[PDB]
From a paper:
Here, we present multiple crystal structures of the Drosophila AHR PAS-B domain, including its apo, ligand-bound, and AHR nuclear translocator (ARNT) PAS-B-bound forms.
We then performed crystallographic studies on purified dAHR PAS-B. Diffraction-qualified crystals were successfully obtained, and the structure was determined at a resolution of 2.6 Å. Next, we compared our dAHR PAS-B structure with the previously reported PAS-B structure of hypoxia-inducible factor-2α (HIF-2α), as the latter is also a bHLH-PAS protein capable of binding ARNT and whose activity can be modulated by synthesized molecules. Although the overall folding was similar, superimposing the two structures gave a root-mean-square deviation (rmsd) of 4.5 Å over 106 equivalent Cα atoms, which indicated comparable differences. The C-termini adopt opposite conformations in the two structures, with dAHR PAS-B folding into a helix (αJ), while HIF-2α presents as a loop. These observations suggest that dAHR PAS-B has a similar overall fold while adopting some unique features compared to HIF-2α PAS-B. CASTp39 assigns 440 Å3 and 680 Å3 cavity volumes for dAHR PAS-B and mAHR PAS-B, respectively.
Residue numbers in the entry: 268 to 381
Amino acid sequence: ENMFKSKHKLDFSLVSMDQRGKHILGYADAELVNMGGYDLVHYDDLAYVASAHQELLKTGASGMIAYRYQKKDGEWQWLQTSSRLVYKNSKPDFVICTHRQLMDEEGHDLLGKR
């Protein structure tokens, strides 16, 4: 359903985002090129995304229960992301992420459980 995917480097910087994700967030391709992994992450969620970044690179998978990504209009879009390392050859190559939109009341309910 309203789930979208995005490709990232191992440092979490954006490589690609599907059209559904760009419609939800409101950004064009030129606005997301060479965009850092924490660029649009809410200040209150920097440490949380950072720890899931460490779990991802050490284990190969990670799950972010609820965090905030700033939309182009200024509003905050709560997300629920599942990250995984994709292997080219037999080395970690890039990161694939599967997100899901969350309502404001839903993301704030998960804030105390993440």
